[PDB]
Design a binder for this molecule. Structure first.
Ligand SMILES: *[C@@H]1O[C@H](CO)[C@@H](O[C@@H]2O[C@H](CO)[C@@H](O)[C@H](O)[C@H]2NC(C)=O)[C@H](O)[C@H]1NC(C)=O
Length: 296
């Protein structure tokens, strides 16, 4: 697209303030992820498109406070995954790069959205511009849809299959807040409790794995953003959320920009907070809510 995409990006900025344009021009380095025109339409963001306050938040997360081209992205993700900050100080992004040359496939994950770069390295004065096929910050998948499409959630998604725990996550009549342990988290659990870990991924113990996951799943009429949990555990003592057959009592705090979860005697870092979905929100955590009282 490019031609159509960029003008559309600016048109959207015009409809919602213009304040966005100020922040962009006040940056020494800036990289914009401009959704294709097809992305701005098929997104059917008709709902939020009218909310000028939200549109600004959506627009802001498409603006990277840095000079980032394909090469730089590849490099930054060499050792670990680089979480890239945006104008939206409540949303960061990160990329995944596959193949090389004309076979290169670049995708980005942000605000609950996974988009593919359909055009990259468009030069700019202080940076670059890339065209993506989806509008970040506007989920087009349910919690379940996300779980099957996010490689980082592969273990938790697979574990929820043995007991058909996942089935329910497609329901649009409820709102789920799923605290999803990332793959690295389950791998760590494998080192801590190799036998119990082998069991969680066995049909024979579907009951156990379901019980473990239901502990991570909050079901209510509303979804809780990490910022909500903080406010709750701040005004009140801790936070109490309804799970499937019981409840979840945790406490959330801010720590050097990241959010932290205090469950029982454990402290787990929230790796990807607020991964919004159409029927809820997902919070990727560093380690699963597990004590060795569920292992022996
Ligand atoms: C966005 O979603 C896609 C689709 O699931 C992810 O693509 C996979 O990426 C892994 C890691 O390179 C590959 O092993 C798979 O083969 C890819 N699937 C396909 C068919 O494309 C992609 O990684 C996600 N992007 C992010 C940043 O999470």
């Amino acid at each position: 697209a490019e031609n159509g995409a960029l003008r559309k990006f600016y048109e959207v900025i015009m409809d919602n303030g213009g304040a966005v344009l100020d922040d962009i021009n006040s940056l020494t380095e800036v990289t914009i992820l401009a959704p294709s025109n097809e992305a701005w339409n098929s997104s059917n963001i008709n709902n939020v498109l009218r909310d000028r306050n939200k549109m600004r938040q959506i627009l802001n997360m498409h603006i990277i406070k840095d000079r980032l081209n394909v090469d730089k992205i590849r490099q930054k993700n060499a050792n670990l995954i680089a979480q890239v900050p945006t104008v939206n100080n409540n949303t960061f992004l990160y990329f995944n790069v596959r193949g090389e040359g004309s076979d290169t496939v670049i995708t980005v994950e942000g605000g609950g959205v996974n988009a593919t770069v359909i055009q990259a390295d468009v030069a700019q004065t202080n940076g670059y511009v890339h065209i993506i096929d989806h509008v970040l910050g506007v989920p087009y998948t349910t919690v379940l849809g996300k779980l099957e499409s996010d490689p980082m959630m592969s273990d938790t998604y697979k574990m929820g299959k043995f007991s058909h725990f996942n089935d329910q996550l497609n329901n649009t009549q409820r709102r789920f807040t799923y605290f999803v342990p990332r793959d690295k988290g389950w791998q760590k659990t494998e080192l801590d409790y190799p036998s119990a870990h082998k069991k969680l991924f066995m049909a024979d113990f579907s009951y156990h794995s379901k019980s473990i996951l239901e502990r991570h799943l909050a079901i209510s009429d509303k979804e809780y953003t990490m910022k909500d949990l903080v406010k709750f555990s701040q005004e009140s003592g801790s936070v109490i959320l309804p799970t499937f057959r019981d409840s979840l009592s945790i406490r959330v705090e801010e720590e050097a920009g990241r959010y932290v979860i205090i469950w029982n005697y454990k402290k787990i870092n929230v790796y990807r907070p607020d991964v919004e979905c159409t029927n809820g929100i997902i919070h990727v955590i560093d380690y699963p809510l597990l004590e060795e009282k569920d292992v022996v």
